[PDB]
Design a protein around this ligand. Structure first.
Ligand SMILES: [Mg+2]
Ligand SMILES: [Mg+2]
Ligand SMILES: [Mg+2]
Ligand SMILES: [Mg+2]
Ligand SMILES: [Mg+2]
Ligand SMILES: [Mg+2]
Ligand SMILES: [Mg+2]
Ligand SMILES: [Mg+2]
Ligand SMILES: [Mg+2]
Ligand SMILES: [Mg+2]
Ligand SMILES: [Mg+2]
Ligand SMILES: [Mg+2]
Ligand SMILES: [Mg+2]
Ligand SMILES: [Mg+2]
Lengths: 223, 86, 180, 66, 156, 125, 186
RNA sequence: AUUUCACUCAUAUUAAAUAAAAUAACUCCAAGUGGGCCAUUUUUGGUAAGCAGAACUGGCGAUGAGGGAUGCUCCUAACGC
RNA sequence: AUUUUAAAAUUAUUUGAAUUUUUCUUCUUAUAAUUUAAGUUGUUUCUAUACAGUACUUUCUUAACCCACUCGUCUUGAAAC
């Protein structure tokens, strides 16, 4: 019938309004947290104490080596972290277990802590989705919000800013949001590397360590 | 469906607003607050100083004391070791 | 402003302690000052020295501050004295050296170059103790005394350093090195 | 004339080619040689239970048809 | 010639520890075992009857048969591309009630009461264990007098 | 070397000659796959003969078209070219080699009436 | 490069088409493929798959076993994707409604004499499009003699496999390896 | 021990984390192979050896492309047009 | 031959509220059009007022620049003295 159309057209409108409201709330949250951190330190200096900041909860990991000549335990961890070829990148939740998984493969990767605008750029410029029945997935670029809501809106995420929120802060829906995305495929950086052989913390030019907030600079060049 | 060209989701306004139903408001607010500032040049950059006198002079003593103490402790360790040498 | 004259060395102030336990619940607090390329390297050296000197490993400690001390008079000239300790091919040694500069890390950069040139000592075998400023009447080295006379003058005796554009490869008159 | 006589190079590469297989995890096993004088008694118990169950089934089939 | 006997290479594995020789205690014979229990095989060399083979020292299995003074155990063993089940028949002195399972039992008994209360007050509680994770921020108060400055040491 | 005229694209135009066919005259130029250890053509050394592969294949939409941009059908007598009256803008005819001149004249003058083109309407004249 | 297994490609492990060339069977396959697709019923999918299998996976079913399977299902329809055969060991037969790919002459006569009926699959497509009140049945698929030679080799301890022998008697493979008196048993 | 009957144990976040985990499990019929060698690390005989004999991984054999002037095994990296 | 729709954006009239107080301020709370949506469209000239010309298509021949050891076989290893 024709009435089949009007109800759907109304439901889409109400869903869009709700998404707008939630995005505004997210913006308020970002600003308020940013301003609270910036005065707690300023007050600590006055009262002769130190303010140790909360640690991170999220990393972004990039592979540095090819696929030949690797020990089996390294290959198992690469399979479990979904890094399959040279310049791929994924998000990882920070635990006591992932840290020990990560120490195994440290001389072959580089990683660190991402900001908000970096998450937004990764999601908008290089964001691809898995679409289909289970175990048949057909990588598709986003271009729209219906695919997100179809698979993942049961947990109240209908839109792209919702996934940004759940990734930049380890929200309750993080395993599903992260597992929903295809692994990122990145260009080589625009001014080259220094030396993949050596580490970031060695007194020489090198790469392979954990570089905490300097990962944003690198992934803006190899976006 | 047949696949088409993939549109740049950051520089194409129509798809950007399609994906983010709240981006138009934020961009408009930023543009308004950007124009307000330039329309008040030769009338801004003056109040900044008169309030910097208000609060930076209060912060200055605390900062100076902190760094003074750090340097003094670093000196104390040096003298204590040099005297220990003999 | 001129990225061809910069060194990548800065100074940092790091504070740490151990995680409080049931046996110890007011653990000692430690501070240091390190010269490094970025703050991540400085934290690396901080935990290295905590483990070597005290019994503190990173995995049961916690960091409290990283601050990056800046320089107050970046255009005045100072005298500096450094204390070293480095490993040679057949032993380990320690020395005292003196430099002239406008910033502490501007002197640390000179020190690394001199220790590579004169002794073939890599940065991984050098530990820096106690950079400090010294007065002009307590200077010990002859090559610093040279520069603090009453009225310092000398002629300029370098060959020219021209732009790449006016470095014409095939000239019409052979130039001069005199330049008075 | 002399040749190699032992190595196990390549052996667990072949072993892990088709994985390391596990036993099939069944529910019952055979009590053939196991504790006598305890399972003969179990046979008697189960015979009694079956006699009761089938007597009830026969009885119900007898009333339901009147 | 090659020498692959039954007890070859058991010099240090099959010998009593320091100042701890002698036969077992009287309470060893009062242990309670049932079918399906978990069990550890630890060879005791002061009793030469029912001695397990070299390989099965220090392994864990399940009971499948109980006799007058013996126990049958099901133990896994890896053979070159697969795991085979073995049936090991040992005497009662080389058998120990396994302790690998106690955290599960304490967890079940403890969580039962928590679930009973939570459903009593109509609540939504989580009972799965928690991986250790990152830490929140805190304000740590220390007087400037208690901070001590340290620097690398000169060589002696 | 890619050749393209309109919508038709050819991915290569040179033949794949047989290895060693320029040096030994008992070896014919028709392509045969090299088998046998130590070849340097089977092992893909640079600087020698290339091997054909499925990657050079043509577009499905333009796989059998002539530069005329029509498919070719070969006829032997008049009665065989009657199915062309329904599809005359997609096909062109060519006359077989072993038909006589008298038969050819009739085939040509019927193709003219049907408004279909003849590829070789100049032979035996 | 990239580290996948069977690189990026999915494996399937069975028969995909008909091998037979009977035109009537091809028409049946077409019909039940259409029914399976346009009404995903799980009843027409299974039937569409079963009439693709080879001969060894479409065994016959006897009359007595068919009557035994239908004892608690009066006025229902039994569906078999094989032949059904007679059984002299039965004394009497009830009234049954059965759809099967083939009937033998004696079985067909016995079924119709008791008031039952025999159906083909194109009639079952016309009367029970989604299989209401229909019971799917199979015959014994591991009763063939060839399956008595499979499994463990005859000679491994405690096996049940038959051997391949010229003939049978005291002179044909009964001496060493099958009794304790000649050096070991099995 | 078993057999019945009654009551009750988180689940939509899945009784710890992570997972292009069902590309799984099983049965049948068969091919080729059963002279190996090399590198970092551990290691036996020998004054030693581009010698003889073992262990765990990765390779060469069965394999081309960029670099090391040159080179079966080193570094980067594995191959449709 | 009926998902190049819907929606979104834009422009010009509107029906009402905010606030950031405005020639890009917001909220499709009413109609029309347009594309920035919904993978390239237009205008001039030449070939040319030709029928095979020295132009265009194609096949041979001969240069340049870079590169390229003799196949088959046994062998851990072949361009092999
Ligand atoms: Mg470089
Ligand atoms: Mg390496
Ligand atoms: Mg032993
Ligand atoms: Mg061709
Ligand atoms: Mg070879
Ligand atoms: Mg590929
Ligand atoms: Mg041989
Ligand atoms: Mg190779
Ligand atoms: Mg060389
Ligand atoms: Mg031979
Ligand atoms: Mg060979
Ligand atoms: Mg030889
Ligand atoms: Mg050869
Ligand atoms: Mg030679």
């Amino acid at each position: 019938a024709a009435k089949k159309i009007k109800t759907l057209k109304l439901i889409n409108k109400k869903k869009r309004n709700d998404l707008r409201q939630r995005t505004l709330r997210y913006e308020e949250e970002y600003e308020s947290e940013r301003k609270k951190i910036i005065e707690l330190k300023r007050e600590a200096r006055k009262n002769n104490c130190f303010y140790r900041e909360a640690e991170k909860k999220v990393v972004f990991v990039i592979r540095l080596k090819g696929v030949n000549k690797l020990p089996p335990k390294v290959r198992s961890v690469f399979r479990l972290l979904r890094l399959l070829q040279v310049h791929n990148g994924v998000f990882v939740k920070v635990n006591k277990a992932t840290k020990e998984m990560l120490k195994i493969v440290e001389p072959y990767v580089t990683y660190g802590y991402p900001t908000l605008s970096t998450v937004r750029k990764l999601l908008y410029k290089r964001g691809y989705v898995r679409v289909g029945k289970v175990r048949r997935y057909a990588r598709k670029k986003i271009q729209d919000n219906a695919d997100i809501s179809k698979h993942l809106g049961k947990y109240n995420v209908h839109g792209i800013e919702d996934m940004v929120y759940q990734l930049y802060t380890c929200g309750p829906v993080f395993k599903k949001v992260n597992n929903f995305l295809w692994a990122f495929k990145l260009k080589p950086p625009r001014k080259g590397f220094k030396a993949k052989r050596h580490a970031f913390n060695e007194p020489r030019p090198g790469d392979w360590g954990n570089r905490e907030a300097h990962i944003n600079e690198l992934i803006n060049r190899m976006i | 469906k047949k696949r088409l060209q993939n549109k740049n989701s950051l520089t194409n306004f129509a798809v950007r607003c399609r994906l983010n139903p709240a981006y138009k408001l934020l961009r408009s607010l930023a543009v308004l607050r950007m124009r307000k500032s330039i329309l008040e040049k030769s009338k801004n950059k003056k109040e900044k100083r008169v309030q910097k006198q208000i609060q930076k002079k209060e912060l200055q003593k605390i900062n100076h004391d902190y760094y003074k103490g750090v340097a003094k402790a670093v000196k104390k360790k040096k003298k204590r070791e040099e005297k220990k040498a003999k | 402003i001129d990225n061809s004259l910069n060194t990548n060395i800065h100074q940092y102030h790091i504070v740490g302690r151990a995680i409080p336990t049931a046996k110890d619940k007011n653990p000692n607090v430690y501070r240091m000052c390190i010269f490094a390329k970025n703050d991540t390297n400085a934290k690396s050296r901080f935990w290295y020295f905590m483990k070597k000197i005290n019994k503190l490993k990173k995995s049961n400690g916690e960091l409290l501050a990283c601050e990056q001390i800046k320089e107050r008079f970046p255009l005045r000239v100072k005298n500096y004295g450094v204390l070293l300790r480095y490993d040679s091919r057949t032993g380990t040694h320690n020395m005292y050296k003196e430099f002239r500069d406008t910033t502490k890390e501007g002197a640390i950069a000179q020190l690394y170059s001199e220790m590579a040139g004169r002794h073939r000592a890599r940065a991984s075998s050098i530990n820096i103790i106690r950079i400090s400023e010294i007065s002009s009447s307590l200077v010990r080295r002859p090559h610093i005394k040279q520069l603090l006379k009453r009225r310092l003058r000398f002629p300029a005796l370098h060959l020219p350093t021209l732009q790449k554009e006016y470095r014409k490869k095939f000239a019409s008159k052979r130039p001069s090195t005199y330049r008075m | 004339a002399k040749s190699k006589n032992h190595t196990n190079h390549n052996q667990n590469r072949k072993a892990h080619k088709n994985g390391i297989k596990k036993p099939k995890k069944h529910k019952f096993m055979s009590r053939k040689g196991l504790d006598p004088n305890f399972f003969r008694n179990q046979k008697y118990c189960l015979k009694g239970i079956q006699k009761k169950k089938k007597e009830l089934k026969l009885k119900a089939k007898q009333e339901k048809n009147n | 010639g090659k020498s692959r006997g039954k007890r070859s290479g058991t010099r240090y594995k099959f010998s009593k520890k320091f100042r701890k020789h002698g036969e077992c205690t009287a309470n060893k014979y009062l242990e309670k075992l049932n079918y399906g229990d978990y069990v550890d095989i630890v060879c005791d060399s002061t009793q030469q009857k029912g001695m397990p083979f070299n390989y099965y020292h220090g392994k864990t299995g399940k009971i499948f048969h109980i006799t007058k003074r013996g126990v049958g155990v099901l133990v896994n063993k890896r053979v070159k591309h697969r795991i085979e089940q073995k049936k090991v028949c040992v005497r009662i002195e080389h058998v120990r009630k396994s302790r690998c399972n106690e955290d599960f039992l304490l967890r079940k008994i403890k969580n039962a009461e928590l679930i009973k209360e939570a459903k009593l007050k109509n609540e939504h509680i989580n009972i799965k264990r928690k991986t250790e994770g990152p830490k929140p921020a805190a304000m740590i108060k220390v007087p400037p007098s208690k901070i001590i400055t340290i620097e690398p040491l000169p060589f002696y | 070397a890619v050749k393209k005229v309109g919508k038709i694209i050819k991915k290569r135009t040179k033949k794949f000659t047989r290895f060693q066919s320029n040096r030994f005259m008992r070896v014919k130029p028709a392509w045969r796959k090299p088998r046998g250890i130590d070849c340097r053509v089977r092992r893909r050394y640079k600087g020698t003969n290339l091997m054909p592969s499925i990657g050079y294949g043509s577009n499905k939409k333009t796989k059998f078209l002539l530069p005329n941009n029509k498919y070719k059908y070969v006829v032997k007598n008049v009665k065989e070219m009657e199915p062309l009256i329904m599809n005359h803008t997609k096909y062109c005819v060519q006359i077989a080699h072993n038909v006589s001149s008298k038969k050819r004249k009739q085939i040509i003058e019927r193709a003219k009436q049907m408004n279909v083109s003849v590829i070789n309407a100049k032979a035996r004249l | 490069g990239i580290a996948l297994k069977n690189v990026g490609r999915i494996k399937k492990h069975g028969r995909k088409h008909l091998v037979s060339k009977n035109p009537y069977l091809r028409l049946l396959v077409k019909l039940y493929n259409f029914l399976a697709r346009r009404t995903n019923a799980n009843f027409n999918k299974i039937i569409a798959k079963r009439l693709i299998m080879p001969k060894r996976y479409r065994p016959p079913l006897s009359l007595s076993k068919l009557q035994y399977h239908m004892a608690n299902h009066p006025n229902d329809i039994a569906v078999v994707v094989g032949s059904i055969t007679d059984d002299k060991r039965l004394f009497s037969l009830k009234q049954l409604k059965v759809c099967a790919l083939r009937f033998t002459e004696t079985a067909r006569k016995r079924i119709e004499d008791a008031g039952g009926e025999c159906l083909t699959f194109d009639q079952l497509a016309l009367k029970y499009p989604t299989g209401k009140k229909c019971v799917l049945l199979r015959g014994p698929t591991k009763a063939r003699t060839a399956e008595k030679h499979f499994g463990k080799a005859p000679g491994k301890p405690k096996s049940k496999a038959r051997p391949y022998v010229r003939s049978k008697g005291r002179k044909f493979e009964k001496a060493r390896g099958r009794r304790k008196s000649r050096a070991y048993k099995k």
